[PDB]
């Protein structure tokens, strides 16, 4: 006699094969659990014949009539002989049917979206000061530089004759112009210090306060920028089951007629009863029909789906915006289900252990979970500055040198218009001074 | 019979259970005291019928026609048999109903809004050094600039001939005037450097040790400056029960016909007698009718609510702009009331002591009073420094420059003064040096 | 009939009075619980007559004969009528005797020593670099300054004639001496920058690498010193009962025949059974005879004594090196014990509540706990630098100016010996140059 | 009868209970499997007599005279009735004894010492910027120093007459040679400033924007430099089961006559077949006789022990120089053994599933495998920067100065070369300029 194996569509355990042809018999199925059953058939030497569950459930106790549904009901009534499927091992299922040893180890955990790690774009260094403070500094170095020009002309001690060798009447100069006064202002702001130093006490206090002002601006900048380069990583506000029980902001449920909600239904510990106190209220709202709708409502809404760890291993290697929030709630396993008192309990108990010692149950999991490449993590650690987060200081350096050379032709043309008043003609005296600049020597 | 339990709906003690289908009976209710009365029924063994109180108070000895009401009249006239609810042990109640022995530790306290806005701290940058340190660096900079001037007018290697062509005779003169030695002292302190640079090793060592001094003071200042650039929110204008007594800006009150109205009514503390002389006058406006009208008038008005401690522990855990002000005024407990001597006081008295030995009173405490963690004040995550944070460096920049325009005129009037004994009293050297500003092109 | 009150020496509840006289009757007793009983006698109008417990225990079940000891055994046998004492309220005591309502609220917690907050002594700023690295920097600025002198004499381009006006033959100088080369070395180390700049490319690379070296020394100094000024507070490695159960490094016990170990003996929760799994093994080693030996063995050895919160309130306000490690394990209370079925249960139940509403039970606790002044905490928060933790940079500044002025008389005497070879006599030509230095003017 | 339970003493599963008085019987034992067998006896209902195994192994199918031993022969010959102990489900055992269904999830892994010493990181200071950034600041400093030279040989305001007395005619000359413009570029980058200061606004803007560039690059460098000055301990030379296969420096082994010796014995993985070809040869030295001789030979020798996962979880939690290397080789479970078909397998199979539903298997897991927290690697608390931390700035200081002595000779041979066409080939301008070093007092 050929056996009749019950099973159910779940990805990647059992799923239909992609082929055009009129698929006949066991042909249309592919996945982990049939490729398990391809190998159990070679060992035990029988003939399986795949035939799905009818009511589309896994198995649960309806507790009105106290009866079962799903693949569990397919076994108790002896309709189908095996249950090669992700049928988990629980306390209430073991009393009515006979499982084998596990071929996979589970854990209930939360499938939730990864939050977006919004990149600190290339103008990230302006962040440690507020955008009105950068203006207040700029109006200061436009202000204080203008105040210093007022005082330096007004103060009769900044008037010094430069002339280190015996003036003998009068060559007295006042080296602070406008263009010198901003350069003292900018030069002290950028901590470099100019070549021009105030001499009168009327201008020392302007030099003294502006040095103290740019001492605090730069020091408050550097102390704050330690915080902004050490970017505090995304910490989406669920990190455990203790967290997820206490906010009704995020919807969280399970699959209906499944071993996930059956866990919370029968549990008596405080956190997990609190989740079932939540889920029993909106029992039609949160409890989705299958795991596939458990996935999709996390993809769209603010939903945190409770499910098994081995299917999260297939989801998060496919969708690189979903993750396993939290740790394993419990531990379970996938048994090849058999009816109560079967001779195939012990022969599969052997033939799972035989496949496990020679690595066949790990060669199949690596094949059908197929990690595919996915961004693992930022790997939270010291965070050496790339081009992506300094970046814009080269942009202002590139734009600053572009803005510079037009002042250089501005200095050229204002000179070439000035000297050509009396000396030579307008266009040619520009080219005359080009002969001066292209000279490779020191000259007049 | 059924042991009729009189209870009164107050969160998080006894509240209605929400669901899809309406429930009927004892399962309508949930909370702390429902979970407690289940534990008393498990240990002792009895049926219990929740019979929520008609006249909606807890209990209060009324005046001249004195008759108890609320849950206390349910106990005196034997309409109830128990009172598992927040019926707090007070003096006047335990004379007439006969309480069991407490199951949770409360006390009268003050509920009030958290202050939103910040203490500005318009300077806030002086903070990383103590004001002992800030005055000592001036007495160092006043100190070093004097001892540098003493050495530089004593060291016979600072006396230098500038005279760059070929030094003949009768030239040498220090560049360290006493005005100049502060400018090395302040100039090195502010990290910007001076035009003065010492020669003459005895003056080098002063310049050497003042540099290493100001290397550490600036480096220690930038270390703590990350910490002290955090705003502090405003300190609430009340911090105790005495603070509400010495004001009428904040109306303060309690639940009418409860233990807290009764406590201030029969108090002989000078603080608390004034706090009832307030409440008795405007009784129609500062005695609310429930706990729920307490919190809603703290939020949607200026108000400070005198309520119990453990009910604050639920509210402030839940609502994050809302905190406890001060410490416990008195200490009292919640006790399961019984009538005037019953065969169920002593049974529950042992039964309450059993639960806190097992820890189940603490387990039920955590189960209801814990909630969302109310994300703390130490959750900074970002601080762009603004006009509130640094602030006062713009004030002292406005302070020093107005000081500088004052001393600029004072020097202008001084060179008017030494040129006065040459020509005239004021207007000679005024106008000729007021020309000096108005020239801006010609030197002398 | 006058009552016979049993009680027991515990501090500060009941203790002998300090007086020389032959103390007669109730005279010799003073403390909290007799001053409680002084006020209960005024209310209820009886005559107490203090008489101690005989066997010196509080009360516990010997569980061999199943009998009691202590004050509990004094009550059951009706020897003494009251039990006005710190006799706690537990489950096993309530079944045999009758307590009143509490007059005080307890909690079991851990009395352990405060660790010493070792002060960061005034040379604290040298800490961010290792003491061999400070030598390696000092041998660098002694090394690199010496290398620069070698190269500058060797390089034929540092030989420049200063002389800004038409040399016409030869005045070519080499301004880098020894004393100039160290000053470039020190001057770049202290970030200030000298007035002397290298000119030949042979000396630019020495100037270039030494600038990059002191860029990293100072930056690694400032980045590390943020950690050392933010002194990570003392965190003595017990912070809870979950911590204290899992190290056998610290002895922890209780008092024998007391309600502290009776809690752990009967508990079934995992952490507190683990402590009783520890304490049952060395039951004679850790379990002290009284609370006073519970105090003293913490004072001397590495012992963490489990005791009641209200006695920790008297200990830690006296001994300012002990503290309450952890939070309250449970909650209990002090009942005035009465025998099983007494008429004085309810009259004291009244007269404790009457004393509590009018604040008498808080006026007595404030008197007999008498906080006395004790250092509360460092109050862990931002830690503004006092003189105690910068400190020594003023010491090296004071010592640097002391070391300077002896170089100034060293520069004076080396000059005064040199010029007196040909010009004048040895001692007088010093005083001649004193006339030069004391001159208030510029001169030759 | 008594249901004789064969068990074998292994921590933290079944260990002797320590006390003062010696205990007798089932109370001699404690640990995980004693707490488990109590739970199986509570649920199912049976007496149990611990009868610790005589021949001290767990179980191993011996060769040609093949007879099981240890706990397995206790089950086959019905000397036991159960085997509640770490008797792990393998293929060859479950054929002959008949296991229950697992209660804890293990797998073979590698125990090995943590590497003590640090990866030195002799430079370690380049780390706060990515090597993309480090090369770009040179291409900026090579870039800006070129474009500053282009403008300064083109701007007709940089051409200045030094000539300080009174400028006549035919003088003006730039101070920006192409050698000089790098010295402004490097000089501003290293925060120290140059003797060069630009005039002529077009050159000011280059100096303006290069200053703000190097203000940010230095400030961003000092921000992350606190993070990257932490040592990393050495990466262990093994990180997997494959790494022990490709070496003979570390002897590696397992418990003789256990599941782990049996697993490599009958493995057909190319990695694991080599790992038994190793162990079989020196079987007398790399197959220890217990778990306890495993850990003691990892510590007191160079050795890497192939043992189970859950027993590593106790040891590495306890001993802090000792860690798990790699991941789980296989996956298997601990099962309560029974004989060849018993009326107690299925009773315990449901009984184990009941306990993990309630969570008591996790409660007993936490109760024994948790211990002292093994104070983590992220417990820095202090880092005085030493010769290991910064280090490489002394290397590049030794690198640049040896480079500088090379270029100093190269310039010395260059002024020998231009003076060669004056007088002689080498020794003329060599010796006369070798005099120039040897003079040190005379100028020219
Ligand atoms: N597949 C599980 C139910 C769904 C789940 O727990 O994720 C079972 O059949 O038991
Ligand atoms: N809990 C109080 C009532 C509320 C209040 O007075 O603040 C009582 O037991 O009477
Ligand atoms: N004084 C306590 C016992 C000692 C203690 O718990 O600290 C009692 O009598 O119950
Ligand atoms: N736990 C192993 C024994 C120890 C080992 O082989 O590493 C077993 O069940 O056989």
Residue numbers in the entry:
A (entry chain C), B (entry chain D), C (entry chain A), D (entry chain B): 431 to 874
Provide the authors' own sentences about this structure as they appear in the paper.
Kainate receptors, a subclass of ionotropic glutamate receptors, are tetrameric ligand-gated ion channels that mediate excitatory neurotransmission. Each KAR subunit has a multi-domain organization, including the amino-terminal domain (ATD), involved in receptor assembly and trafficking, the ligand-binding domain (LBD) that binds agonists, competitive antagonists and positive allosteric modulators (PAMs), the transmembrane domain (TMD), which forms an ion-conducting channel, and the carboxy-terminal domain, which determines surface expression, synaptic localization and interactions with intracellular proteins. Here we present cryo-electron microscopy structures of the kainate receptor GluK2 in the presence of the agonist glutamate and the positive allosteric modulators lectin concanavalin A and BPAM344. Concanavalin A and BPAM344 inhibit kainate receptor desensitization and prolong activation by acting as a spacer between the amino-terminal and ligand-binding domains and a stabilizer of the ligand-binding domain dimer interface, respectively.
Despite observations of several configurations of the GluK2–ConA–Glu–BPAM complex, with one or two molecules of ConA bound and type I or type II ConA–LBD interfaces, all these configurations demonstrated a similar structure of the LBD–TMD region. We improved the resolution of this region by averaging the focused signal across all configurations and further refer to this LBD–TMD structure as GluK2Glu–ConA–BPAM. Compared with the agonist-unbound open-clamshell LBDs in the closed-state structure of GluK2BPAM, the individual LBDs in GluK2Glu–ConA–BPAM show Glu molecules bound, with each clamshell closed via a 20° rotation of the lower lobe D2 towards the upper lobe D1. In the context of back-to-back LBD dimers that maintain their two-fold rotational symmetry and intact D1–D1 interfaces in both GluK2BPAM and GluK2Glu–ConA–BPAM, the 20° closures of individual LBDs lead to a marked separation of the D2 lobes, exemplified by an increase in the distance between Cα atoms of S670 from 20 Å in GluK2BPAM to 30 Å in GluK2Glu–ConA–BPAM. In the context of the dimer-of-dimers arrangement, the separation of the D2 lobes results in LBD tetramer expansion. We measured the channel pore radius in GluK2Glu–ConA–BPAM and observed that the gate region became much wider than in the previously published GluK2BPAM structure. Indeed, during equilibrium molecular dynamics simulations of GluK2Glu–ConA–BPAM incorporated into a lipid bilayer and surrounded by aqueous electrolyte solution, the channel pore remained continuously hydrated, and monovalent cations freely permeated through the gate region in both directions in the absence of applied voltage. In response to Glu binding, the separation of D2 lobes in LBD dimers leads to LBD layer expansion, characterized by the substantial increase in the distance between D2 lobes of diagonal B and D subunit LBDs.
